[PDB]
């Protein structure tokens, strides 16, 4: 604890209406998108159109995210001993957030300017440091503004959803062309469809030539991603509403919804990280040892993609050809990706403090009970509801990811689901609170 005079946005004294909120969200989004397209000054195809490297958004939201996860882990491991009974330790924690983020920004900026390919030879170095510092400070202040109450929600999730939708739309309506021997071809699906339908004048052949397009995006992937988007939107309304009633103040009746997608999409990320790590480890080990009685069994790599090994079994299927090739690998991969997701979802609800015991404790604290049941049975009733919901939600998310990667959509099921969840949160909040 100490005294700090740092720039911070003050919360509104009254609730902000929906129109001002939406317009501020839009303005902040436009500023964040324009900030990441401008290159630096002193630095010496495009080579910077794909990733945000060489622009004012070099660091981006990485320092904020790293500080957030570090202090979240520090809170989870029970080393801060925070108590919600006071309104000062919370502010101290919020200022610790910022004083750690600032020093991390400084360190990372110095590392990049001293090591990156911008150039070793003083005023230019000072300018390159100041640009990155000012941009990171602007992004942090903008996130704080959107989170304090002037925006529909957080900033990080909004920026991620915006990037996902931007990539989805650039994979389809890209004006860039590519000429490799045969001629000039658009890098988009709809653009090339209309081009080949207009100029080629051979409809029966141009339609088939523009619908499959083994080398580039086509219309089939667009139809598949639209269908998957609609299906994901349908599976967002599933919810289990159990009736509850109050006992402190009589006359308060409501419902407690238990969604299908219970977890926060963290276990799928953990499972993908785990399988990627074990695959790369098997690759490196097979590279180190050519032939061994056990290493030949654990993994074999050849023409890179592993074959006749455990890493070959756990590798993801790219298209339907590999699926119809050998059903054994397909069924093993399906069972693995579903079981691991279910187990990770159960463990995550057991760890993250959303277990049925915590919900029963919250019920006892607020005084609520279940409508047609006793008071000593809320725990025994939530035990028969919450774990099943979490496991089935994890299994459904895994199956959706597998189907999306199999049918070859423009975006993986995980990103589509994250964006859909982020937007459905805003929609549900606006419907519950009441606004245009």
């Amino acid at each position: 604890p100490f005294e700090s005079f740092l720039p911070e946005v003050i919360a509104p004294e009254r609730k902000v209406p929906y129109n001002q909120k939406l317009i501020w969200t839009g303005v902040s989004l436009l500023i964040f998108l324009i900030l990441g397209q401008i290159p630096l000054y002193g630095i010496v195809l495009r080579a910077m159109l794909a990733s945000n490297r060489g622009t004012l958004l070099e660091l981006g939201v990485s320092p904020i995210i790293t500080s957030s996860m570090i202090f979240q882990f520090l809170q989870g491991t029970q080393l801060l001993q925070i108590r919600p009974e006071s309104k000062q330790d919370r502010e101290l924690f919020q200022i610790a957030q910022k004083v750690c983020a600032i020093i991390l920004i400084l360190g990372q900026a110095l590392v990049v300017v001293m090591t990156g390919n911008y150039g070793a030879p003083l005023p230019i170095c000072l300018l390159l440091i100041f640009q990155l510092m000012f941009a990171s400070l602007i992004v942090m202040l903008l996130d704080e503004l959107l989170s304090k109450g002037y925006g529909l929600g957080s900033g990080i999730s909004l920026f991620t959803a915006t990037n996902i939708a931007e990539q989805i739309f650039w994979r389809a309506f890209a004006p860039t062309t590519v000429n490799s021997g045969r001629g000039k071809e658009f890098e988009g699906a709809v653009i090339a469809f209309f081009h080949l339908l207009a100029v080629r004048k051979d409809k029966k052949r141009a339609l088939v030539e523009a619908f499959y397009r083994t080398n580039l995006p086509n219309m089939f992937q667009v139809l598949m991603t639209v269908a998957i988007f609609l299906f994901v939107l349908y599976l967002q309304g599933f919810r289990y509403e159990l009736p509850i009633r109050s006992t402190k103040v009589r006359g308060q009746i409501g419902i407690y919804p238990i969604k299908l997608f219970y977890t926060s999409n963290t276990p799928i990320m953990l499972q993908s990280a785990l399988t990627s790590n074990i695959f790369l480890i098997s690759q490196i080990l097979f590279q180190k040892y050519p032939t061994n009685p056990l290493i030949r069994l654990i993994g074999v790599w050849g023409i890179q993609m592993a074959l006749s090994g455990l890493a070959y079994y756990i590798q993801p299927l790219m298209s339907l050809s590999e699926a119809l090739l050998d059903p054994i690998k397909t069924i093993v991969y399906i069972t693995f990706v579903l079981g691991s997701c279910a187990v990770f979802s159960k463990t995550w609800i057991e760890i993250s403090g959303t277990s049925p015991r915590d919900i029963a404790k919250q019920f006892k604290d607020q005084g609520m009970v279940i409508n047609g049941k006793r008071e000593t049975s809320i725990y025994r009733e939530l035990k028969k509801i919450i774990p099943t919901a979490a496991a089935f939600g994890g299994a459904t998310i895994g199956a959706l990811s597998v189907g999306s990667d199999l049918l070859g959509t423009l975006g993986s099921g995980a990103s589509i689901l994250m964006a859909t969840t982020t937007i459905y949160g805003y929609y549900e909040a606006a419907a519950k609170e009441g606004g245009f």
Binding site: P7, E8, V9, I10, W24, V27, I31, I34, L35, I38, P39, Y41, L56, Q131, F134, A135, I138, L141, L142, L145, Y150
Partner: protein
């Protein structure tokens, strides 16, 4: 402490300053 309009003005000013520096360097290299 800081108003939303202040943040918008800061962002637009920084962006315009970087773009002005770029175009000034470009026209200086083109002229001399």
């Amino acid at each position: 402490r800081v108003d939303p309009l202040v943040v918008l003005f800061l962002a637009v000013g920084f962006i315009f300053s970087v773009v002005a520096l770029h175009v000034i360097s470009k026209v200086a290299g083109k002229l001399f």
